[PDB]
Amino acid sequence: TIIKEFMRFKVHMEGSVNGHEFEIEGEGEGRPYEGTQTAKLKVTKGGPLPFAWDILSPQFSKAYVKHPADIPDYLKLSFPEGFNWERVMNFEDGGVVTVTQDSSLQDGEFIYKVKLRGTNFPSDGPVMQCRTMGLEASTERMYPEDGALKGESKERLKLKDGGHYDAEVKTTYKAKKPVQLPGAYNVDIKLDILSHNEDYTIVEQYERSEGRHS
DSSP states (O other), rough: SSSSSEEEEEEEEEEEEEEEHHHHHHHHEEEEEEEEEEEEEEESSOOOSSSSGGGGGGGTTTSOOOOTTSSHHHHHTTTTOEEEEEEEEEETTTTTTEEEEEEEETTTTTEEEEEEEEEETTTTTTTTOOOEEOOOOEEEEEETTTTEEEEEEEEEEETSSOOOOEEEEEEEEEEESSSOOOSEEEEEEEEEEEEEESSEEEEEEEEEEEEOOO
């Protein structure tokens, strides 16, 4: 009854990257049980951003992961109260991003609130010079620990020169109430930028995410 086959969301992000402050507002929609979703993001303060969109793209929706019947869908089951998540991304050149997120259901729509901080990106590296061109498909290795659901992934940002620029990502996902946890499993993720204006103050992205066993 609570999570319909088709669901919209609204997202607000406040962030700082290498001391550059910004805000983003977005609107998304998708099919939670099919693991598909699309979002349109607008930079509302601090635009245009002087860094790679690709470090922000993974911060804009874990209710939209397709799960087999036998793996508890902890994050869908958390609604209507919802869940929080805390992420650390460690980039190979010493850049660090921390993210905190609150997910709730209000008036039939998911409501996302994101706070992000990025530091220690080299001024001449691929993030601050915008030399990335999207993310490779990734796998998030999920496991229960300390009464929460944790995830680890390796993100590979595509380089204008054909190589990759990598990050180690660790996320802890906590339902607001006690919700049945799964065992360990894998989530395959593919995030695509569909469109953007020339300065990436308007961006459309899509993600397909599906859970499976180890």
